């Protein structure tokens, strides 16, 4: 979730949704990098597992799909940002109450 420039991955959720590939936006390119012996990986993927992990992969894919791909159509419609700072937010909610 913290790649710079973000252009490198910003199309990945769309591509995964288009291609039917389950994806999760996850905290840490450093965390991804430590599981591939790098400082930073920016992406990780499983193309196949062993039988002893197929059920764990299936259940985790189901939870990850419920969190990312199944929300993709709604998340695509909503703008982030527009959040105020501490002082501006205070001075906004006092005028919401006052008038």
């Amino acid at each position: 979730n913290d790649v710079d420039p973000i252009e490198l991955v910003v199309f990945l959720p769309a591509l995964c949704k288009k291609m039917g590939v389950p994806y999760a936006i996850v905290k840490g390119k450093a965390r991804l990098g430590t599981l591939v012996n790098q400082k930073t990986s920016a992406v990780a993927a499983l193309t196949e597992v062993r039988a002893e992990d197929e059920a764990a992969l299936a259940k985790l894919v189901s939870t990850i799909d419920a969190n990312f791909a199944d929300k993709y159509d709604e998340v695509k419609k909503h703008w982030g940002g527009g959040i105020l700072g501490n002082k501006a937010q205070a001075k906004m909610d006092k005028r919401a109450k006052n008038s």
Partner: protein, 99 residues
């Protein structure tokens, strides 16, 4: 086509046995591949539309092709690009309307 054997006229020139050389791989520099079509379609739906493209779609919906093409010629530099851009916006309009 075929030379007429004389020095003036429509197909003037010397009659010679022709050979039709094998096509160069250049002369296909401007060809859409399956990779390019996929990538451009994904980027279209990710990035959405430009402000002038949105104005063009509104113009097509409201005043029609002639006024849309005039503004498109202004925004782009030429009539041939204005036309191509306007039938493009027609395609987005048609796809959004149908189904």
């Amino acid at each position: 086509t075929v030379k007429t054997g004389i020095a003036i006229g429509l197909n003037k020139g010397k009659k010679v046995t022709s050979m039709t050389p094998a096509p160069k791989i250049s002369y296909k520099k401007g060809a859409a591949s399956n990779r390019t079509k996929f990538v451009r379609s994904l980027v279209r739906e990710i990035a959405g539309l430009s402000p002038y493209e949105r104005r063009l779609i509104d113009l097509i919906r409201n005043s029609g092709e002639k006024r849309a093409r005039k503004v498109a010629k202004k925004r782009l530099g030429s009539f041939t690009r204005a036309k191509a851009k306007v039938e493009e916006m027609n395609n987005i309009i048609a796809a959004s309307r149908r189904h």
